[PDB]
Amino acid sequence: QCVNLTGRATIQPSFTNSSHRGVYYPDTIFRSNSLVLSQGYFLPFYSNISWYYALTKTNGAEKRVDNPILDFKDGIYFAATEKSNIVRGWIFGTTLDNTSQSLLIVNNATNVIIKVCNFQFCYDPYLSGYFHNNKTWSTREFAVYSSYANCTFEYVSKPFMLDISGKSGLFDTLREFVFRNVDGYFKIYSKYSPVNVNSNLPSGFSALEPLVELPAGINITRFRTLLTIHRGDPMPNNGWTVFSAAYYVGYLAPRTFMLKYNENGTITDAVDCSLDPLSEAKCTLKSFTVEKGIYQTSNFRVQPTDSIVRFPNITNLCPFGEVFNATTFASVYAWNRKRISNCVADYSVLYNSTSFSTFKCYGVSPTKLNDLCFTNVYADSFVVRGDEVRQIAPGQTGKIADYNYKLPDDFTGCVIAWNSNNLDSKVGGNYNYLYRLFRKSNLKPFERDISTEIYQAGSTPCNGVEGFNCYFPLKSYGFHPTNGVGYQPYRVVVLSFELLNAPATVCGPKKSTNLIKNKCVNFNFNGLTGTGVLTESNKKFLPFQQFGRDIADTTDAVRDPQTLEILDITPCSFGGVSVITPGTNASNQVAVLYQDVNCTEVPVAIHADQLTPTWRVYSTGSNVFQTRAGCLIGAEHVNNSYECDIPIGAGICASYQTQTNSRSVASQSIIAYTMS
Amino acid sequence: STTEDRAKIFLDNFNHEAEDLSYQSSLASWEYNTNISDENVQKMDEAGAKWSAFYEEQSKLAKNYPLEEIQTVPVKLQLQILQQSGSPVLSEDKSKRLNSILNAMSTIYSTGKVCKPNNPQECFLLEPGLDNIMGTSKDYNERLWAWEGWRAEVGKQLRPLYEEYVALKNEMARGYHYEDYGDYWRRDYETEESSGSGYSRDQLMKDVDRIFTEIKPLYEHLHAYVRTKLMDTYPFHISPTGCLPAHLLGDMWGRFWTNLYPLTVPFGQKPNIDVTDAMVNQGWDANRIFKEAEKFFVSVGLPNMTEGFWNNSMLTEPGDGRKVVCHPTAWDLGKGDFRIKMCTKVTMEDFLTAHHEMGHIQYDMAYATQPYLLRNGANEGFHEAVGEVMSLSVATPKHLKTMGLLSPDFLEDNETEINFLLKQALNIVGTLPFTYMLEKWRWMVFRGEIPKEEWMKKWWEMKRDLVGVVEPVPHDETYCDPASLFHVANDYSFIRYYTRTIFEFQFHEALCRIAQHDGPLHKCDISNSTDAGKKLHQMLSVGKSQPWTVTLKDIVDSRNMDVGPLLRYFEPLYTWLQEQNRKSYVGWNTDWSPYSD
Ligand SMILES: *[C@@H]1O[C@H](CO)[C@@H](O[C@@H]2O[C@H](CO)[C@@H](O)[C@H](O)[C@H]2NC(C)=O)[C@H](O)[C@H]1NC(C)=O
Numbered sequence A: 001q002c003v004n005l006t007g008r009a010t011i012q013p014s015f016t017n018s019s020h021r022g023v024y025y026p027d028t029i030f031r032s033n034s035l036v037l038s039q040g041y042f043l044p045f046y047s048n049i050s051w052y053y054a055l056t057k058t059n060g061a062e063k064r065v066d067n068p069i070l071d072f073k074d075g076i077y078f079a080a081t082e083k084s085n086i087v088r089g090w091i092f093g094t095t096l097d098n099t100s101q102s103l104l105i106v107n108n109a110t111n112v113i114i115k116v117c118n119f120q121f122c123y124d125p126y127l128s129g130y131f132h133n134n135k136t137w138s139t140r141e142f143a144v145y146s147s148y149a150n151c152t153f154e155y156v157s158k159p160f161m162l163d164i165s166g167k168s169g170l171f172d173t174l175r176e177f178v179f180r181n182v183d184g185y186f187k188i189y190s191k192y193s194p195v196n197v198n199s200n201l202p203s204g205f206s207a208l209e210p211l212v213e214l215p216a217g218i219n220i221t222r223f224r225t226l227l228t229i230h231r232g233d234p235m236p237n238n239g240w241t242v243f244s245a246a247y248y249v250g251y252l253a254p255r256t257f258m259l260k261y262n263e264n265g266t267i268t269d270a271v272d273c274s275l276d277p278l279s280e281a282k283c284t285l286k287s288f289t290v291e292k293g294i295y296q297t298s299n300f301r302v303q304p305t306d307s308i309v310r311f312p313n314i315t316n317l318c319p320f321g322e323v324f325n326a327t328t329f330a331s332v333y334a335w336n337r338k339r340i341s342n343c344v345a346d347y348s349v350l351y352n353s354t355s356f357s358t359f360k361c362y363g364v365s366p367t368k369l370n371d372l373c374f375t376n377v378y379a380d381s382f383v384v385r386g387d388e389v390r391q392i393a394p395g396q397t398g399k400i401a402d403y404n405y406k407l408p409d410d411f412t413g414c415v416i417a418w419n420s421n422n423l424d425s426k427v428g429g430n431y432n433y434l435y436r437l438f439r440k441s442n443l444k445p446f447e448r449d450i451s452t453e454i455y456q457a458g459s460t461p462c463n464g465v466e467g468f469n470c471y472f473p474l475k476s477y478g479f480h481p482t483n484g485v486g487y488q489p490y491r492v493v494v495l496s497f498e499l500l501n502a503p504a505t506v507c508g509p510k511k512s513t514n515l516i517k518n519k520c521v522n523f524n525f526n527g528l529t530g531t532g533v534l535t536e537s538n539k540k541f542l543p544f545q546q547f548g549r550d551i552a553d554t555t556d557a558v559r560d561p562q563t564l565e566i567l568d569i570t571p572c573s574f575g576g577v578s579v580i581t582p583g584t585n586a587s588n589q590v591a592v593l594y595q596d597v598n599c600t601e602v603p604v605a606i607h608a609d610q611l612t613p614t615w616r617v618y619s620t621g622s623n624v625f626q627t628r629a630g631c632l633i634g635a636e637h638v639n640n641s642y643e644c645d646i647p648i649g650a651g652i653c654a655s656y657q658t659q660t661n662s663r664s665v666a667s668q669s670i671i672a673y674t675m676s
Numbered sequence B: 001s002t003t004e005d006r007a008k009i010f011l012d013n014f015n016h017e018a019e020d021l022s023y024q025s026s027l028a029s030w031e032y033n034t035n036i037s038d039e040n041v042q043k044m045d046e047a048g049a050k051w052s053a054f055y056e057e058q059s060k061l062a063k064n065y066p067l068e069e070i071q072t073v074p075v076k077l078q079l080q081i082l083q084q085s086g087s088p089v090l091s092e093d094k095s096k097r098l099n100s101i102l103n104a105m106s107t108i109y110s111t112g113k114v115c116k117p118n119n120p121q122e123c124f125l126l127e128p129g130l131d132n133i134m135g136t137s138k139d140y141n142e143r144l145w146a147w148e149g150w151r152a153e154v155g156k157q158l159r160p161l162y163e164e165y166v167a168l169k170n171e172m173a174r175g176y177h178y179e180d181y182g183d184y185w186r187r188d189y190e191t192e193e194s195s196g197s198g199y200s201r202d203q204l205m206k207d208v209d210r211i212f213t214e215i216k217p218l219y220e221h222l223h224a225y226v227r228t229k230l231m232d233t234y235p236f237h238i239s240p241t242g243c244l245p246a247h248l249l250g251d252m253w254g255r256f257w258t259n260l261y262p263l264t265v266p267f268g269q270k271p272n273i274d275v276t277d278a279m280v281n282q283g284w285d286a287n288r289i290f291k292e293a294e295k296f297f298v299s300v301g302l303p304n305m306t307e308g309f310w311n312n313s314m315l316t317e318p319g320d321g322r323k324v325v326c327h328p329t330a331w332d333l334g335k336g337d338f339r340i341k342m343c344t345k346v347t348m349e350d351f352l353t354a355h356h357e358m359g360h361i362q363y364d365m366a367y368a369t370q371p372y373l374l375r376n377g378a379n380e381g382f383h384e385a386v387g388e389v390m391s392l393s394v395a396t397p398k399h400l401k402t403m404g405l406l407s408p409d410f411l412e413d414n415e416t417e418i419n420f421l422l423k424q425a426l427n428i429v430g431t432l433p434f435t436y437m438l439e440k441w442r443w444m445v446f447r448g449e450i451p452k453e454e455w456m457k458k459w460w461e462m463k464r465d466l467v468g469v470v471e472p473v474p475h476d477e478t479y480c481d482p483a484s485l486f487h488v489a490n491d492y493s494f495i496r497y498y499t500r501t502i503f504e505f506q507f508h509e510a511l512c513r514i515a516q517h518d519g520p521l522h523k524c525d526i527s528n529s530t531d532a533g534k535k536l537h538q539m540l541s542v543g544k545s546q547p548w549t550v551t552l553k554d555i556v557d558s559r560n561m562d563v564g565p566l567l568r569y570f571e572p573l574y575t576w577l578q579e580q581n582r583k584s585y586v587g588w589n590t591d592w593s594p595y596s597d
């Protein structure tokens, strides 16, 4: 119903700099001010943000009233913000159809309501404002503006204050914001405040505070913009015309920031890790200050796009239900070995049970044993006392460790114990459980000893009797319901876990997400966390085993348990990096080493071809330097050198040299002059 | 390996089966000792004969283990417990006669009723029907009647039985490589030359005597004080410089001086220690008394009560007819459970017995990590001493005021502190020469230097020489005047209480020094004293495993016992007494007797 009449423009994007703008605060409530890496959907710094200028200096004035196709993927930075209440309101349908669900966004103060509903409409909606006596010029206009019905998601509240009247200067506005809708969390995090420039995206410090979370969570893969052309009087020609505006569209990528969280989530120096070698150096420093010297960065030049996990499709219920509610009443000499076989267990859910006494682990913490899952597992359920529960720890030796069930000095597992009062206690004495307090030597770990021999104490050939020097090792506990807590009947299950190259058998409960084809992702697989591009390359791999090694435990190869297909991990970026001369001082430019592989393979093998323009003018398409340790892009060769003395600059002479004396246009650089 | 490892693994085996079956042995002992029935008779039969049989055969097969070959001194001292407590040298007939003697003693002493000739049917038992008769009951002609009737009612059936019992116990100790029954009672205070400098039982007699020599003046001043305060209440029945009548003490057979305190407080017209009506109106029952005890014990830094200590171990009558022979009794059952019983009232002395056996339990859990044959007191004295130190520290009126027991308007002047020290002086020092003379009389009897025809004329002469008490009728020799007490009927060792009071003020000197609380040990409450409490906790935890002389050297930096803690506990009371008995004369005279006068 809307036709592309006069006024429309072509795509004509302005791929300008995103600057140091647009950082939101996850975890709005105050934290322990850790300056740790924050990984997820986040906005690239200084990326090619598409600025379109919808100005009205002339009649046309290159009016960006167009409705261009714009992809959402994993988030948007939107700074289409101005105090003059122009182009307010936007439509964010997933495909912009009747099938798609449109998540409107209100940036005006007259009605703060966010509803999805259906919102089926044509190519171009519109809004206008003619005249009103309260400096609002009737911003609400008689139009269609699509429709709302049977709304799946709704947010109604008081129309609180956002903006009013008009901007005093050209873009006297710093009210930028970022959206991405995921898992019942929606970010409308904004920075409503006026800051005036001439005409540019300002390089002010990205410190936009959290605003609200919404439980909508509907997936968005594409979106669209929305315009407001004034009917009454934008100009005295009384035509349909958007007032002077200059609006911004950027996208969020999987990447990492450095956030202080000092005072309720505030920050001092926001640093996007995949910006430049200085930024990744800062991310590796775990602080907000660059050092001065040779420096190795973390492997986050390109971040994992997705966190792929590939567990075997087991969906089995483990016998742990009859392990903690077990009728199997063993003893420490007759300790069980109940193999759980191939199953999926509710790991650390028994840890949530408040009726249990001691869940010490010694090697794999209760948190990391839900997602790292295990090739082999045994139960080891039997009965001990309280001092014996203290004894059953692997580093402790005694009559229940040395002369009974012994644990190895590493054990890579966990042990649980709890009280079996009124479960293993008989009023006349529950002697049915036993122990072996006598043995010829200490028991090796996981050595069963049912042998009820005469124990041959001294040199007495007993042969079935307990003489003066002959003693029966198989001796009972002697529980009572009145017995004390140190001698109380305790049921212990020594949940022995071990991970080998064998395929995983019992794993933690989670959904195995569908594998990606070719992208640098956070591979988990059978709990094997790490970073790299998933590839279908086939190598000499044994079919049964899954854990690869490659070189120095690079573990390139890992098996998909569903289709039994090898899936190699080739890291998206490699180590062996070195910031030759960082930028703590006025040497603003920066370059880090990449690989002994030549830098011509950086966009294609190290995969920097789809990065920010900073990685273009700094790392893919700029000056190339090479050393014995590898190659880097960002610094340039020179024939002048000196004795290499200071540890700055790897091997070929480079340090914090100055260049302002020759010319003050660019100040210092990273030209490899001399290790000062 | 050598035989030391064989002895170690044997003691490991013996300890574990000892806990395993002695737990239900002590449990059945507790079950009989809390409910009287007809099948608990067979419960005693099994919990006796069975445990005795396995303990005796495990010690009997230990005889081949050489003691001197053992290098490990806890294992060594385990062998001196186990091997020296070997097979009884009496025959089966003689030993079963001895056990029947013990049963006859307990039964006929626990059934004693002094009954008036006009109405012999209506009369009271000893506890709790006759303890009041020697107390608040004035007009002492019926006190004389009850005294003489009780002495006759024990004498006419227990004089020759005790006389023959002495010969059997002396024969039992003679085969145990000990000279007499007193020596087997004193074997608990035995050390080695490497650590405890030997400390034979000859050192025990000389130490007991040198303790008694300089507690005699304090007791003499106290006895003169009590004589002067029984002058006005009791006309002409007490000599000004003589002894005091035996039938006119606080309780039966002159054991405690507790109920003489209302009759002997100087200026108790002001509000004082007594809180019994406030115990009634505050709702503080026996159980709340015990929660007060565990607040005191978590304040001092000792472990609190266990869940078994909640649910089992009923103190008083449970309302279900469970008849109990209630006496203040703790129970180290072994393993993990510990129990308490007595007819728990709300009075002061029973409140201190509650803390006393509660400290017994704290002692028992503190060396609960020890072997079972080591799971006893560090001697016969420490085991009662720790609980009595707890009972004495909790009794201080400053402590009573701090945790809300005592009235807010109570005064901490010198005179009321002297009144409290006087109550403690009765409850302790009126028993010191009594227990000294009784245990020394036992030692003389078991040594046998006095024949049976002169036991009584000896008994009443150090009753006038060591404890300074005269009696109305010496009962010739046909009665059994020293045999009507509880610990002598059931034949408990009675140096336990004497050395309890000896080590009591030594441990209280430690718990006033390391705890650093002010006041010359009078208001020196040990609550909220973690460092001194934990130092006491290692002093408990070493237990019997290291000899108690070394334990004393650890706690008070003195390897031997001494009287001087009595001086630092009682010196304002003592100095008060010299300014109190200045009218009378300190000491006693054996010449004046109610039968002689
Ligand atoms: C096993 O016994 C426990 C109680 O001992 C049962 O109780 C809980 O059940 C919930 C599920 O409704 C579990 O999440 C808890 O872990 C269980 N335990 C506790 C301590 O809360 C449980 O239902 C029993 N299971 C079976 C299969 O009989």
Ligand SMILES: *[C@@H]1O[C@H](CO)[C@@H](O[C@@H]2O[C@H](CO)[C@@H](O)[C@H](O)[C@H]2NC(C)=O)[C@H](O)[C@H]1NC(C)=O
Binding pocket: B031, B032, B035, B036, B037, B039, B040, B043, B320, B321, B322
């Ligand atoms: C009295 O003591 C006995 C111990 O001998 C307790 O044990 C029960 O005694 C009754 C006698 O009427 C027997 O019928 C039961 O079989 C005994 N129970 C056992 C052996 O487990 C008895 O509980 C005590 N009385 C009360 C009221 O508790």
Ligand SMILES: *[C@@H]1O[C@H](CO)[C@@H](O)[C@H](O)[C@H]1NC(C)=O
Binding pocket: A351, A352
């Ligand atoms: C219980 O489980 C939750 C996961 O839902 C976990 O966050 C929590 O830490 C567990 N409880 C304890 C005490 O660890």
Ligand SMILES: *[C@@H]1O[C@H](CO)[C@@H](O)[C@H](O)[C@H]1NC(C)=O
Binding pocket: B304, B305, B306, B307
């Ligand atoms: C003993 O003290 C511990 C520590 O305060 C407490 O957890 C326990 O419940 C207490 N036991 C009692 C009061 O029986």
Ligand SMILES: *[C@@H]1O[C@H](CO)[C@@H](O)[C@H](O)[C@H]1NC(C)=O
Binding pocket: B310, B311, B312
């Ligand atoms: C101890 O617990 C048992 C069962 O839990 C109960 O029957 C008994 O009354 C308890 N004893 C107490 C609370 O003294």
Ligand SMILES: *[C@@H]1O[C@H](CO)[C@@H](O)[C@H](O)[C@H]1NC(C)=O
Binding pocket: B299, B399, B402, B403, B527, B528
């Ligand atoms: C000290 O002990 C008393 C008991 O007498 C108790 O009430 C109090 O809470 C303890 N602590 C302090 C700080 O007074």
Ligand SMILES: *[C@@H]1O[C@H](CO)[C@@H](O)[C@H](O)[C@H]1NC(C)=O
Binding pocket: B414, B415
């Ligand atoms: C002891 O108490 C009395 C009051 O009964 C007092 O006069 C006297 O001074 C006190 N003694 C000392 C040493 O203060």
